[PDB]
């Protein structure tokens, strides 16, 4: 999960730079340390963590600088004790500050697991739809973010298109696109002469895809398929016990609204009554305010087909080995040992994670997302950690941590 050991010579460990060596930038400070002055550092299950960094290592290899560590990872026996000398010869450590602090938030994520099936049954009847064969992305210049222009669209290719006044095909009043400062593309179909929104989800709830979209799998629960959308990922367990893992591949970019707050204001539910069990429980005794309820989120993720989710390093993620970062402050790949408590039992969790995922939310230099796993157990959890960490970069020897604006 891996087990296996590569036989042959020990990769060059190049050379550390000393204790209290300092690099700063965008308000981050990074200093070295001795790896004896991280929490409990020698007492950690460091064969984990070395499973961890090997599945990076896929694609982490290829990056420069990372090459001899990510071989000399899968030439290091799945024991704590070589592990733990493999992170101590082969990285340094350095103590992250943020804005003058230490200290940060660390929070948790999990993939959902849903009763559903690969082929429509009685039960599994609610589709999982992969990127529609209308659905178009154009890359939306920083320029154009105010959102009012009258431009004209060009489809270059399947599921994309582009911005071109001069030789465009179809209009776009950018105004009625749900554009924000931090929309990089909008998603939209060609109709007639115009390039449009894509369907919201009320819409594709409707069935506006039908016929139009692959479809990878249903979901037992309509509900329990919505909360997955708000995670980007999952897993479908079929009545067989089989798993299919189900990848985020894009969204129609609509605003996401809050539920919760809608059910609240209708008086269906208080607003404390908000959670997926509870809202699962009330559409299982009300299921004619279920299209209405879920159409108020026009927000909508198409998946595609993939053990783990997949993140940012295009990796598959080990459960309580892994989180998101911030990639300003943390190089993707990097192991990190993060100090904090555990949710529920309160006893410290210090641990080597690998940095491997990054999330829109997921800001600053002290800030982990936390990747508990995937399964009801690892949901609970998620949703309980809202701690503070303390996080300390392990990068291969001579690499220094920078700030990238």
Same mark, same amino acid.
């Given at each position: 999960?891996?087990?296996?050991?590569?036989?042959?010579?020990?990769?060059?460990?190049?050379?550390?730079?000393?204790?209290?060596?300092?690099?700063?930038?965008?308000? #981050?400070?990074?200093?070295?340390?001795?790896?004896?002055?991280?929490?409990?550092?020698?007492?950690?299950?460091?064969?984990?963590?070395?499973?961890?960094?090997?599945?990076?290592?896929? @694609?982490?290899?290829?990056?420069?600088?990372?090459?001899?560590?990510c071989?000399?990872?899968?030439?290091?026996?799945?024991?704590?004790?070589?592990?733990?000398?493999?992170?101590?010869?082969?990285?340094?450590?350095?103590?992250?500050?943020?804005?003058?602090?230490?200290?940060?938030?660390?929070?948790?994520?999990?993939?959902?697991?849903?009763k559903?099936?690969?082929?429509?049954?009685?039960?599994?009847?609610?589709?999982?739809?992969?990127?529609?064969?209308?659905? +178009?992305?154009?890359?939306?210049?920083?320029? !154009?973010?105010?959102?009012?222009?009258?431009?004209?669209?060009?489809?270059?290719?399947?599921?994309?298109?582009?911005?071109?006044?001069?030789?465009?095909?179809?209009?776009?009043?950018?105004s009625?696109?749900?554009?924000?400062?931090? $929309?990089?593309?909008?998603?939209?179909?060609?109709?007639?002469?115009?390039?449009?929104?894509?369907? $919201?989800? @009320?819409?594709?709830?409707?069935?506006?895809?039908?016929?139009?979209?692959?479809?990878?799998?249903?979901?037992?629960?309509?509900?329990?398929?919505?909360?997955?959308?708000?995670?980007?990922?999952?897993?479908?367990?079929?009545?067989?016990?089989?798993?299919?893992?189900?990848?985020?591949?894009?969204?129609?970019?609509?605003?996401?609204?809050?539920?919760?707050?809608?059910?609240?204001?209708?008086?269906?539910?208080?607003?404390?009554?908000?959670?997926?069990?509870? +809202?699962?429980?009330?559409?299982?005794?009300?299921?004619?305010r279920?299209?209405?309820? !879920?159409?108020?989120?026009?927000?909508?993720?198409?998946f595609?087909?993939?053990?783990?989710?997949?993140?940012?390093?295009? $990796?598959?993620?080990m459960?309580?080995?892994?989180?998101? +970062?911030?990639?300003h402050? +943390?190089?993707?790949?990097?192991?990190?040992?993060?100090?904090?408590?555990?949710?529920?039992?309160?006893?410290?969790? @210090?641990?080597?994670?690998?940095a491997?995922?990054?999330?829109? #939310?997921?800001?600053?230099?002290?800030?982990?997302?936390?990747?508990?796993?995937?399964?009801?157990?690892?949901?609970?959890?998620?949703?309980?950690?809202? $701690?503070?960490?303390?996080?300390?970069?392990?990068?291969?020897?001579?690499?220094?941590?920078?700030?990238?604006?």
């Amino acid at each position: 999960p891996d087990t296996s050991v590569i036989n042959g010579p020990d990769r060059p460990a190049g050379i550390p730079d000393p204790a209290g060596t300092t690099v700063a930038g965008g308000g #981050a400070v990074y200093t070295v340390v001795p790896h004896l002055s991280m929490p409990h550092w020698a007492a950690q299950d460091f064969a984990k963590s070395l499973q961890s960094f090997r599945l990076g290592c896929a @694609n982490l290899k290829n990056r420069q600088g990372w090459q001899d560590v990510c071989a000399q990872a899968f030439q290091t026996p799945i024991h704590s004790f070589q592990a733990k000398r493999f992170f101590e010869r082969y990285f340094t450590p350095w103590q992250v500050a943020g804005n003058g602090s230490l200290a940060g938030t660390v929070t948790g994520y999990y993939e959902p697991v849903l009763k559903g099936d690969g082929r429509r049954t009685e039960r599994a009847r609610f589709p999982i739809y992969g990127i529609p064969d209308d659905f +178009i992305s154009v890359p939306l210049p920083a320029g !154009l973010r105010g959102g009012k222009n009258l431009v004209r669209i060009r489809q270059t290719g399947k599921n994309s298109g582009t911005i071109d006044n001069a030789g465009g095909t179809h209009t776009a009043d950018l105004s009625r696109f749900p554009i924000t400062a931090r $929309t990089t593309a909008i998603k939209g179909r060609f109709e007639g002469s115009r390039f449009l929104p894509y369907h $919201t989800r @009320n819409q594709i709830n409707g069935g506006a895809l039908d016929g139009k979209a692959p479809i990878l799998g249903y979901a037992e629960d309509p509900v329990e398929l919505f909360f997955m959308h708000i995670q980007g990922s999952g897993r479908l367990k079929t009545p067989s016990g089989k798993y299919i893992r189900i990848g985020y591949a894009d969204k129609n970019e609509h605003p996401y609204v809050s539920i919760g707050r809608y059910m609240a204001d209708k008086g269906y539910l208080k607003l404390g009554q908000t959670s997926m069990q509870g +809202i699962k429980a009330y559409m299982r005794q009300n299921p004619q305010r279920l299209a209405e309820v !879920l159409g108020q989120n026009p927000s909508y993720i198409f998946f595609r087909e993939l053990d783990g989710p997949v993140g940012a390093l295009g $990796t598959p993620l080990m459960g309580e080995y892994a989180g998101a +970062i911030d990639r300003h402050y +943390i190089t993707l790949g990097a192991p990190l040992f993060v100090a904090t408590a555990h949710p529920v039992t309160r006893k410290a969790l @210090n641990r080597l994670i690998m940095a491997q995922d990054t999330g829109s #939310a997921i800001k600053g230099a002290v800030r982990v997302d936390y990747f508990w796993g995937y399964g009801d157990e690892a949901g609970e959890l998620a949703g309980k950690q809202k $701690t503070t960490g303390y996080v300390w970069q392990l990068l291969p020897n001579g690499m220094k941590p920078e700030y990238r604006p």
